[PDB]
Amino acid sequence: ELDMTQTPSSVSAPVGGSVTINCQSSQSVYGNNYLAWYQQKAGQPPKLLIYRASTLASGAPSRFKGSGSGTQFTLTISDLESDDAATYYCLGYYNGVINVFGGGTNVEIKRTVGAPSVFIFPPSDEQLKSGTASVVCLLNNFYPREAKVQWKVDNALQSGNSQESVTEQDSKDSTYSLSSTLTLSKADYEKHKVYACEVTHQGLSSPVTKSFNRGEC
Amino acid sequence: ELDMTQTPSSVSAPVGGSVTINCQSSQSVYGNNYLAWYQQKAGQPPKLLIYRASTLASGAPSRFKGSGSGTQFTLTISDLESDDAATYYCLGYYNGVINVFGGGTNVEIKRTVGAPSVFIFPPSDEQLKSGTASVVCLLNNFYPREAKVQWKVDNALQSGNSQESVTEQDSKDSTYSLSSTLTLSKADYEKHKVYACEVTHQGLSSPVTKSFNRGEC
Amino acid sequence: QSLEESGGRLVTPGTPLTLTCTVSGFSLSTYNIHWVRQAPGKGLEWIGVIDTGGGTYFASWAKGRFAISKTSSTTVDLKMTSLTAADTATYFCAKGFDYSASTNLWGPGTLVTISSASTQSPSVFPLTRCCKNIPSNATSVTLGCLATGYFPEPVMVTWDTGSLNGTTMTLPATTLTLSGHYATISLLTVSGAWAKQMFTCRVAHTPSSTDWVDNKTFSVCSRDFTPPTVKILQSSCDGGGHFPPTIQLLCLVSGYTPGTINITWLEDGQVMDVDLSTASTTQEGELASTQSELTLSQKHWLSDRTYTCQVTYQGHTFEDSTKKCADSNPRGVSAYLSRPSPFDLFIRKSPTITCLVVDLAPSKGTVNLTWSRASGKPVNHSTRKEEKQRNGTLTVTSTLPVGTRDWIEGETYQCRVTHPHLPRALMRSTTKTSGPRAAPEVYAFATPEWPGSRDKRTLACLIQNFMPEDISVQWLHNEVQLPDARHSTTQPRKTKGSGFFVFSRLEVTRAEWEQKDEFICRAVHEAASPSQTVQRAVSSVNPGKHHH
Amino acid sequence: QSLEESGGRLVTPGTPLTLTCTVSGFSLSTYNIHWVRQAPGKGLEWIGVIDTGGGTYFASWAKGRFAISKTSSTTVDLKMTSLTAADTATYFCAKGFDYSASTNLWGPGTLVTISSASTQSPSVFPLTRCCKNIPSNATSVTLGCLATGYFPEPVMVTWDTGSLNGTTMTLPATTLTLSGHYATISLLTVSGAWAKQMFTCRVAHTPSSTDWVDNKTFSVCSRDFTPPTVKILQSSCDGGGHFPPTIQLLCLVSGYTPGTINITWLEDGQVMDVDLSTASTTQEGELASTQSELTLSQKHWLSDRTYTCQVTYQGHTFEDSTKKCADSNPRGVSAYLSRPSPFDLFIRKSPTITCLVVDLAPSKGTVNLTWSRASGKPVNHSTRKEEKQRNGTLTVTSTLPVGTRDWIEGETYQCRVTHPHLPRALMRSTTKTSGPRAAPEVYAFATPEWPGSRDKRTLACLIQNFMPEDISVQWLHNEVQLPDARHSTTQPRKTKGSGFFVFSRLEVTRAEWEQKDEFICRAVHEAASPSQTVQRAVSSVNPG
Amino acid sequence: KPKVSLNPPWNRIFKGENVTLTCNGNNFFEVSSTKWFHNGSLSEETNSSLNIVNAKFEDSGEYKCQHQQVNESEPVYLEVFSDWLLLQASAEVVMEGQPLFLRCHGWRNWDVYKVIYYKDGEALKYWYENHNISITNATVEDSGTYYCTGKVWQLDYESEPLNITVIKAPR
Ligand SMILES: *[C@@H]1O[C@H](CO)[C@@H](O[C@@H]2O[C@H](CO)[C@@H](O[C@@H]3O[C@H](CO[C@H]4O[C@H](CO)[C@@H](O)[C@H](O)[C@@H]4O)[C@@H](O)[C@H](O[C@H]4O[C@H](CO)[C@@H](O)[C@H](O)[C@@H]4O)[C@@H]3O)[C@H](O)[C@H]2NC(C)=O)[C@H](O)[C@H]1NC(C)=O
Ligand SMILES: *[C@@H]1O[C@H](CO)[C@@H](O[C@@H]2O[C@H](CO)[C@@H](O[C@H]3O[C@H](CO[C@H]4O[C@H](CO)[C@@H](O)[C@H](O)[C@@H]4O)[C@@H](O)[C@H](O[C@H]4O[C@H](CO)[C@@H](O)[C@H](O)[C@@H]4O)[C@@H]3O)[C@H](O)[C@H]2NC(C)=O)[C@H](O)[C@H]1NC(C)=O
Ligand SMILES: *[C@@H]1O[C@H](CO)[C@@H](O[C@@H]2O[C@H](CO)[C@@H](O[C@@H]3O[C@H](CO[C@H]4O[C@H](CO)[C@@H](O)[C@H](O)[C@@H]4O)[C@@H](O)[C@H](O)[C@@H]3O)[C@H](O)[C@H]2NC(C)=O)[C@H](O)[C@H]1NC(C)=O
Ligand SMILES: *[C@@H]1O[C@H](CO)[C@@H](O[C@@H]2O[C@H](CO)[C@@H](O[C@@H]3O[C@H](CO[C@H]4O[C@H](CO)[C@@H](O)[C@H](O)[C@@H]4O)[C@@H](O)[C@H](O)[C@@H]3O)[C@H](O)[C@H]2NC(C)=O)[C@H](O)[C@H]1NC(C)=O
Ligand SMILES: *[C@@H]1O[C@H](CO)[C@@H](O[C@@H]2O[C@H](CO)[C@@H](O[C@@H]3O[C@H](CO)[C@@H](O)[C@H](O)[C@@H]3O)[C@H](O)[C@H]2NC(C)=O)[C@H](O)[C@H]1NC(C)=O
Ligand SMILES: *[C@@H]1O[C@H](CO)[C@@H](O[C@@H]2O[C@H](CO)[C@@H](O)[C@H](O)[C@H]2NC(C)=O)[C@H](O)[C@H]1NC(C)=O
Ligand SMILES: *[C@@H]1O[C@H](CO)[C@@H](O)[C@H](O)[C@H]1NC(C)=O
Ligand SMILES: *[C@@H]1O[C@H](CO)[C@@H](O)[C@H](O)[C@H]1NC(C)=O
Ligand SMILES: *[C@@H]1O[C@H](CO)[C@@H](O)[C@H](O)[C@H]1NC(C)=O
Numbered sequence A, B: 001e002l003d004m005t006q007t008p009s010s011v012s013a014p015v016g017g018s019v020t021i022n023c024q025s026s027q028s029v030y031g032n033n034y035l036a037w038y039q040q041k042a043g044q045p046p047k048l049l050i051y052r053a054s055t056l057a058s059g060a061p062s063r064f065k066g067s068g069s070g071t072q073f074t075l076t077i078s079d080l081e082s083d084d085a086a087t088y089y090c091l092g093y094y095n096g097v098i099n100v101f102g103g104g105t106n107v108e109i110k111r112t113v114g115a116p117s118v119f120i121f122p123p124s125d126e127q128l129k130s131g132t133a134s135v136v137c138l139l140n141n142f143y144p145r146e147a148k149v150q151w152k153v154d155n156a157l158q159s160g161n162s163q164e165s166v167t168e169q170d171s172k173d174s175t176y177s178l179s180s181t182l183t184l185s186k187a188d189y190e191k192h193k194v195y196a197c198e199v200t201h202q203g204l205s206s207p208v209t210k211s212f213n214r215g216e217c
Numbered sequence C: 001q002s003l004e005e006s007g008g009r010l011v012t013p014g015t016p017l018t019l020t021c022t023v024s025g026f027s028l029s030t031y032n033i034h035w036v037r038q039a040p041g042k043g044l045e046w047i048g049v050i051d052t053g054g055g056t057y058f059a060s061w062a063k064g065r066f067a068i069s070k071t072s073s074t075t076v077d078l079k080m081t082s083l084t085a086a087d088t089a090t091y092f093c094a095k096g097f098d099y100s101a102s103t104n105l106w107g108p109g110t111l112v113t114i115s116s117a118s119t120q121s122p123s124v125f126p127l128t129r130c131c132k133n134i135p136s137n138a139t140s141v142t143l144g145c146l147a148t149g150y151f152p153e154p155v156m157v158t159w160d161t162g163s164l165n166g167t168t169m170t171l172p173a174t175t176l177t178l179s180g181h182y183a184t185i186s187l188l189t190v191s192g193a194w195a196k197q198m199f200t201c202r203v204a205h206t207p208s209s210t211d212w213v214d215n216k217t218f219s220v221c222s223r224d225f226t227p228p229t230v231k232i233l234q235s236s237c238d239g240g241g242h243f244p245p246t247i248q249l250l251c252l253v254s255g256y257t258p259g260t261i262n263i264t265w266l267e268d269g270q271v272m273d274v275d276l277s278t279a280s281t282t283q284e285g286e287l288a289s290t291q292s293e294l295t296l297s298q299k300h301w302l303s304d305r306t307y308t309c310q311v312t313y314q315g316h317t318f319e320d321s322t323k324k325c326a327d328s329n330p331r332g333v334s335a336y337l338s339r340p341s342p343f344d345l346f347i348r349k350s351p352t353i354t355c356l357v358v359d360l361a362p363s364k365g366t367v368n369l370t371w372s373r374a375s376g377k378p379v380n381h382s383t384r385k386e387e388k389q390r391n392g393t394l395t396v397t398s399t400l401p402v403g404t405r406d407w408i409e410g411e412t413y414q415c416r417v418t419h420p421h422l423p424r425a426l427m428r429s430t431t432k433t434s435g436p437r438a439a440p441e442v443y444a445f446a447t448p449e450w451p452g453s454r455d456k457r458t459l460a461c462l463i464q465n466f467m468p469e470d471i472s473v474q475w476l477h478n479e480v481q482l483p484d485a486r487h488s489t490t491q492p493r494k495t496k497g498s499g500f501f502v503f504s505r506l507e508v509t510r511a512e513w514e515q516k517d518e519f520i521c522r523a524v525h526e527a528a529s530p531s532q533t534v535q536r537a538v539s540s541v542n543p544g545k546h547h548h
Numbered sequence D: 001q002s003l004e005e006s007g008g009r010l011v012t013p014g015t016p017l018t019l020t021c022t023v024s025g026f027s028l029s030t031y032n033i034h035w036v037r038q039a040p041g042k043g044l045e046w047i048g049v050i051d052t053g054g055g056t057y058f059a060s061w062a063k064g065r066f067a068i069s070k071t072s073s074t075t076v077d078l079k080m081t082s083l084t085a086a087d088t089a090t091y092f093c094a095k096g097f098d099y100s101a102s103t104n105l106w107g108p109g110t111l112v113t114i115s116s117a118s119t120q121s122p123s124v125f126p127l128t129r130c131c132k133n134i135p136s137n138a139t140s141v142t143l144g145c146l147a148t149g150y151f152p153e154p155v156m157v158t159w160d161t162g163s164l165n166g167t168t169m170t171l172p173a174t175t176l177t178l179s180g181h182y183a184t185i186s187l188l189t190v191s192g193a194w195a196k197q198m199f200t201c202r203v204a205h206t207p208s209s210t211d212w213v214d215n216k217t218f219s220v221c222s223r224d225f226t227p228p229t230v231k232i233l234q235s236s237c238d239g240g241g242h243f244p245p246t247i248q249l250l251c252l253v254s255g256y257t258p259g260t261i262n263i264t265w266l267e268d269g270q271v272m273d274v275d276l277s278t279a280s281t282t283q284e285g286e287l288a289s290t291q292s293e294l295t296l297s298q299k300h301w302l303s304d305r306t307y308t309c310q311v312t313y314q315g316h317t318f319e320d321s322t323k324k325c326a327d328s329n330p331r332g333v334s335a336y337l338s339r340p341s342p343f344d345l346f347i348r349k350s351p352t353i354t355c356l357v358v359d360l361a362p363s364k365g366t367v368n369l370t371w372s373r374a375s376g377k378p379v380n381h382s383t384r385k386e387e388k389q390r391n392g393t394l395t396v397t398s399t400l401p402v403g404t405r406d407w408i409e410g411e412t413y414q415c416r417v418t419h420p421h422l423p424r425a426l427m428r429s430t431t432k433t434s435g436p437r438a439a440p441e442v443y444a445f446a447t448p449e450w451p452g453s454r455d456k457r458t459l460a461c462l463i464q465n466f467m468p469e470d471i472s473v474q475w476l477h478n479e480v481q482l483p484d485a486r487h488s489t490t491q492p493r494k495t496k497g498s499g500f501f502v503f504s505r506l507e508v509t510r511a512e513w514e515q516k517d518e519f520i521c522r523a524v525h526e527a528a529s530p531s532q533t534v535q536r537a538v539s540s541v542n543p544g
Numbered sequence E: 001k002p003k004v005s006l007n008p009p010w011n012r013i014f015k016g017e018n019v020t021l022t023c024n025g026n027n028f029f030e031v032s033s034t035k036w037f038h039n040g041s042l043s044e045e046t047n048s049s050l051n052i053v054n055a056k057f058e059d060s061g062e063y064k065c066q067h068q069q070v071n072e073s074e075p076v077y078l079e080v081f082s083d084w085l086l087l088q089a090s091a092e093v094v095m096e097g098q099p100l101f102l103r104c105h106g107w108r109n110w111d112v113y114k115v116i117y118y119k120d121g122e123a124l125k126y127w128y129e130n131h132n133i134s135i136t137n138a139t140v141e142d143s144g145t146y147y148c149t150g151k152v153w154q155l156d157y158e159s160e161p162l163n164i165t166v167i168k169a170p171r
């Protein structure tokens, strides 16, 4: 019935900036301060930053500040670092023992440009007895996120047969890692010779290409 | 008009026996003894044995005996040797100066049995440039004359493509010599591999085969 | 002082599920336990709380489907009923100071999947770069494993680097677009003496089994050699077009870097005895050349059998193929449909049927392959493999799981084959045999010892007078069921009176009978009693007690 | 004191001829001269006589065609006219004491031929044996010369032996049956250092010219006339039977004494361009090996042209040829050809093979079925049989009895079928295996009693590890072989290692084992020793 | 009345095949327009020849034509099959002495081998390749249920049977 409205759903600020995340409640919380602020990254449980709407949790840095009362609550993150890019939540506790989470807010941190390191992996012979061939292109330690991967099989641009897996933003250098897997069959792999991965990134002046030949390794 | 019959045309006796050759004339000879007996071998002029129907010629042995008178005359050859195997003739001289030869009588000696020495000759390379191949089987120094030569070309018996040459009886050891020539075309000679000559003779307990494979000389 | 969640797995919709939060360090008589879930791509969502007294309080959307219980002093159970696909989530348990879920101590979460696909084990393959593209001065190197084709999430990859240090990066999974299965990579970056170091990845898939562990052990190179080329030459027919009485096959392995090499000839894929063929290797300069000669009868050549030249060189396989040549090669599509084996029905208790479609011409487009039941009841999801063959055709295999009770009560299953280039649909059907029943007789025998067969013996088994014809025979030795490939089994034939028979032949080695001389021939058959199996043991010692 | 004839020569019919009898030692004013002729293969025949006064008298058949004249004190001429082929004869002149021709002094005779064929010079070829068939010791050796293809008679052969005394003998001539020409073989037997000695035959042919002289010079031995073995190998079509864009042909000249060699390719008998093929040569020990690779377009191969590998080694030509294969079902017909059963071969000792041809049309015109061996030796008659089938097709079956020994030594037998509607003849061939031999193992077992089946038992026989796969199995009870319908045997399948196995199954009744409880499983197999038969009996008894 | 002609004559075709129905009679009235009747429903074609391109299963059934005369034409029936081998035939009912052609036809010009025709169970004729029995006359014993066994792309296929019956030309 009752609502926790977390605004905005996404906010962006560079290193040294500040973000403000507001939670508005339809009904006032239990004893007008029972709200928490949590930080959660990918694959991890959420970590408590604020409990009782102003009190800093143990281990949380002092740059996270919480404020507000009643229905209106605000988390302000000043002095922004590259570690702080995560999804942030608020938790309202109510009468009748009801805990309602907030909608969530993604925080995006603008940091320095890193070029990807490109590696190409031919499929191994144990997959070459199963009738499938997967060629792997790896983009390592790049900032920012936006990069384009193109597959060239005998200089022909592939479409509909490649899939990309991207990691979360890292906790020590805040770069990204990408992989594109090119999936082909037995006969489509052995009818072609040269296999190229072309990577376009804004840290690169030209799209870099790593290639190999089938059987000439 | 007048006839002079020599009987038999062929007579056979072994070594140490005797043969009788009779000549009967339709008209009696001039002065009832003018008849001669001649011995002729192959490639030679006839040699006089008897003249005047009983008188031995000079150089003839005493074992040749002529007899007879009028129309009926007889040569007897007792104590027969292997040299005496020849063709014997009777010559009648008549009134009106008429000389009539007899029909001839072949005298066949049985002497000791010699097995043939078999040799086989492939055709030479100068014949192989001419489109014809002649394969030679030689049977050397045998007695008696009766022998059989069979040609085997890839174990198939040949018929109609071989010819035999037989020498006269020798003046020293009284043996015979034979050759069989198998005549083939160049396309037929190069389509077959093994070439065999099989010799059957009365002095051989088994037919002896001399063979050659194409080349391997 | 920590918390950990367990019990998250793949179940069907409607299946109840129990998770266990195991705590350590604190007491549940002082602290409460919160339960929070989170779908993939969605934020956090509170489920419930149990207090120290055992009272459970939930959210508004729970509606009694969730129950929390204190089972021991360290474990708290959460039970779910009425699960649909919206409950596919990572579940966290938390140590609550009060009824508010404002806390700093959380567990890592466990993952619950509600879907309707097959549980598939991952296929793990090494990922090494091209060593010609790997520089020689490379102080560090990046390597990996691909764990693909599994369903569902998760797998976990650890790394054995030996004495070297290694940074391990595991990327998130991608759903494969054709199959729906998942695929992960794990990358390991090492430094130092990596060129002689032997690296292992350990991939575990707890939805398959708890102790499903795959170790892929590999070194980091892919430089091999200069590649040989294989070609096969053959005898000519003569000037009249007629075959010679024997056929020579010459397998030529052209110029390669010298090394150990093996040649196997195959007749329709089956290994031939090495005595009927020769092989020769020569070396000219720095390069080797290999030839292999095979002799065949004219009859075998005219019987249209396919022969394969198999080259094994430095742990890499090369191959070439041949069959009797032809001016024109017509072929049409054919289809075969099996019944489940008794072993799968009654021992494994997981029967399947297979529709195998062979000799199709690889035209444009995929071939339509549909399963159906005459009753109109639903079929399970099937699996489909398409494989290009040595003789140039494409063979498609579809395997359908069938219900055990469904099969036993006489259901008829249909395989329907459609394709645009087909004239009409190809139709196959299969069903339990409508004949009566009769149990197998089993007799096992050993051949005697005689010269030349001291350390290798032939064992035999006769199975007879059973009806109907569908039977599975296996051999068991020392509490392991031996592989099917170890023995040979004839096709069922009719007995003179009533019923069928089969023969099985198993060659055994000295080490096996010295290990245990008891060998059991076992037949699985629908008419067997009381549990659809019959078995007999034999000892091959069979001692010569003359006149008893 | 001798006489000699001259002037005998080949002349045409109607040509007058003059012979001259030259005498020595005696006077023609004292002695008469007789003329006598002799046809080849016939007897002597008196022609005439001239006396001392010049009066000539002739035989009754002469009719004035012959004339004798005294030309000088030593020569007497015989003029002979109106000649036909019956006057082809050897002519003798004789010193007659009186008008009778009873005399001991005759000339050697001269040869007069009346013929109508072309004058041909002889072709002279050496006749040497094979030097591997000539032994190493071989104290005397015999060699020869063949002077063939000449017309007419005669040739004369003399011999140059070098330093050897030698024996020569010249055989009489044979008329060639195809051409009408003559051929002689003159042989020479030598001894001593014949292996290094160069021998020469002089063949002279005075019918060609008076100084036609052919001295032919050769040795007994050289090296082998080395016959380098030609074989043609070809490209593969692939595993689906499809042809590749080009065809490689490989001509192999394997294991020969080294020397000059040339390889030419023909496409339907015409020489192809030199750049279309490449040849290479290697040597191993003594033996050389040569190869040549020819590239053909797919279209040319499929056009059914004949490709010939022409090998010229030391000036002599060796050949092999090829064309596109015939794929054994020209009109959809099938033909099958079996091997003998081992039971028929080794027990009954009357092996047979059977050729079966199916799916022929039932039209008119009888099929032509012929049997043959690759060696050309004879085959027997067979049981030719035709019958129309219920599906409207016609099958022809033939069964040929074959020799037991003939089969065991590896003969190949060929079944040949020609039908008027078929475009070409269809062939099937069968032969003994080229693989190894391994005798079968025989094991025989009796089942124990099963509850409820008191009056029946099953016997099982295992036959294994034999090579080759052809085998017969029989069961015997009370020394007589049981009918084949009583027992069931599987088809041969490979074991795990070497060889094949089969199982045999025989259900028996209580009456049979109470009559005799011993039953024999017998296998007949070609590798079994000593009589291709190995058996094992079994009883349904206990040790007790 | 006009009559309806078929090009090709065969009233049994394969799916996907073409065919053209022409319909003409004596020219007592001049040919201006024609009417077509698939099953009884009037077709939207006026011209005397109706084309039938790419047959579907619904193209089966009773056919008829008409001109500006009073009374209609006969009920020709057109069966359409999808299968491997259709033993096509000239006419379903025949009268003595007109030609009868048989054809064991295979899908999309494909070549059927080892072809055998059956008349009433027994094997009438067999040929290696596909063949074209042509009996110019028709006895009253020729009436039978026909079918053909064939081999298309090495596999065996039997055609659906077709009953054919001859009748006597007096009365
Ligand atoms: C009834 O009888 C006829 C026999 O006459 C059968 O086939 C006819 O085939 C011709 C040949 O194709 C069709 O004519 C035209 O075909 C064009 C495509 O082929 C041509 O063009 C390419 C290059 O573009 C060349 O390589 C090729 O060799 C040809 O020269 C079409 O583009 C034409 O235009 C329209 O047709 C298509 C049909 O799908 C439409 O979808 C388009 O929108 C376009 O407007 C043209 O059709 C001819 O049409 C065929 N006849 C019929 C009636 O279709 C029929 O198959 C047969 N019916 C059966 C067996 O059911
Ligand atoms: C004019 O009148 C006509 C006759 O009155 C009408 O013709 C009839 O049309 C229907 C539908 O068009 C025909 O039914 C056919 O289609 C269905 C579905 O097809 C599927 O099954 C087939 C099995 O043969 C497959 O081959 C297909 O690829 C597809 O998967 C089938 O149920 C029918 O099969 C049955 O009938 C045939 C004989 O026709 C048998 O061989 C089968 O074994 C099965 O028994 C048909 O294929 C219907 O057959 C047809 N009537 C006749 C007599 O042929 C027509 O609709 C009408 N036109 C208009 C415009 O009104
Ligand atoms: C029936 O078969 C006909 C084959 O001849 C099909 O063709 C013709 O189609 C045209 C246009 O659709 C019709 O033309 C119409 O009628 C008249 C006549 O014009 C025709 O003749 C002149 C010469 O006299 C020529 O120059 C034209 O090009 C036309 O061919 C005109 O008023 C118009 O052109 C008008 O378009 C024809 O009438 C028609 N021919 C016949 C004989 O009907 C016709 O498509 C088929 N009918 C179908 C499929 O329904
Ligand atoms: C084989 O092919 C023929 C055509 O190619 C078929 O046609 C003709 O059929 C008649 C049938 O009898 C043959 O006989 C002639 O008949 C006519 C007229 O028939 C009269 O008699 C019958 C019998 O009572 C009666 O029913 C009729 O109405 C007539 O009154 C006579 O005038 C002749 O004398 C003759 O007998 C024809 O010979 C035949 N023609 C040819 C060219 O063969 C024939 O029917 C076919 N046969 C079968 C079995 O199908
Ligand atoms: C035999 O069976 C065929 C069906 O296969 C019946 O149809 C006729 O077949 C012939 C030859 O296939 C057609 O002849 C045509 O000749 C021209 C000129 O050579 C060529 O351009 C065509 O492609 C075709 O070969 C004929 O038109 C066709 N007739 C019909 C009405 O379809 C045939 O009636 C059967 N009987 C006989 C006696 O041929
Ligand atoms: C169409 O069929 C009808 C069938 O009744 C024909 O009717 C004719 O009617 C007249 C008048 O009674 C009769 O004298 C005739 O015997 C009927 N039959 C025939 C065959 O003419 C009608 O004429 C037919 N139309 C045409 C054009 O033939
Ligand atoms: C361990 O890693 C460091 C980088 O963090 C690298 O420089 C070092 O050489 C590595 N040591 C070994 C033994 O590989
Ligand atoms: C993989 O390696 C680990 C580390 O020793 C070991 O515990 C585990 O049993 C191995 N698994 C397999 C399947 O070899
Ligand atoms: C031919 O050989 C004979 C035999 O010795 C010899 O006398 C003669 O001179 C030779 N001919 C020539 C032309 O040298």
Ligand SMILES: *[C@@H]1O[C@H](CO)[C@@H](O)[C@H](O)[C@H]1NC(C)=O
Pocket (backbone or CB within 6 Å): D164, D165, D166, D167, D189, D190, D191
């Ligand atoms: C030459 O004469 C002697 C004398 O007996 C003899 O031994 C030798 O064999 C003769 N040579 C030939 C070749 O006959």
